[PDB]
């Protein structure tokens, strides 16, 4: 159960948040959305593929800090 952390600046709070929902399809794994921290921590069996697609979906900036 590896964890992947991605840095994304919420621009479409309203839409960017809804965009995260689509991640379940790409990832379908456990994910957490913390606006107050502006950070998203998701654990996937693939990692480095589900986050980028979802994060960039709303055209929000995406930066990979690294994964286990």
């Amino acid at each position: 159960m590896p964890k992947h952390e991605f840095s994304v600046d919420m621009t479409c709070g309203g839409c960017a948040e809804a965009v995260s929902r689509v991640l379940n399809k790409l990832g379908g794994v456990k994910y957490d959305i913390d606006l107050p921290n502006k950070k998203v921590c998701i654990e996937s069996e693939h990692s480095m593929d589900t986050l980028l697609a979802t994060l960039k979906k709303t055209g929000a900036t995406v930066s990979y800090l690294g994964l286990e």
Side-chain angles (χ1 to χ4, degrees):
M1 273 196 273
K3 294 134 163 189
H4 184 321
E5 49 176 326
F6 232 112
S7 232
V8 77
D9 223 327
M10 181 276 265
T11 314
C12 270
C15 240
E17 160 269 335
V19 136
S20 75
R21 301 213 84 258
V22 316
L23 188 143
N24 278 266
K25 144 58 102 198
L26 207 313
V29 294
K30 253 68 84 281
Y31 63 108
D32 234 308
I33 323 179
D34 295 22
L35 243 67
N37 264 290
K38 324 167 53 159
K39 88 191 243 75
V40 196
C41 23
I42 146 173
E43 34 268 70
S44 350
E45 306 184 356
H46 259 22
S47 291
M48 210 206 161
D49 193 290
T50 150
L51 326 100
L52 32 152
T54 303
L55 271 45
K56 88 199 204 201
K57 225 295 167 145
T58 3
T61 333
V62 76
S63 302
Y64 99 81
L65 315 170
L67 67 115
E68 264 162 86

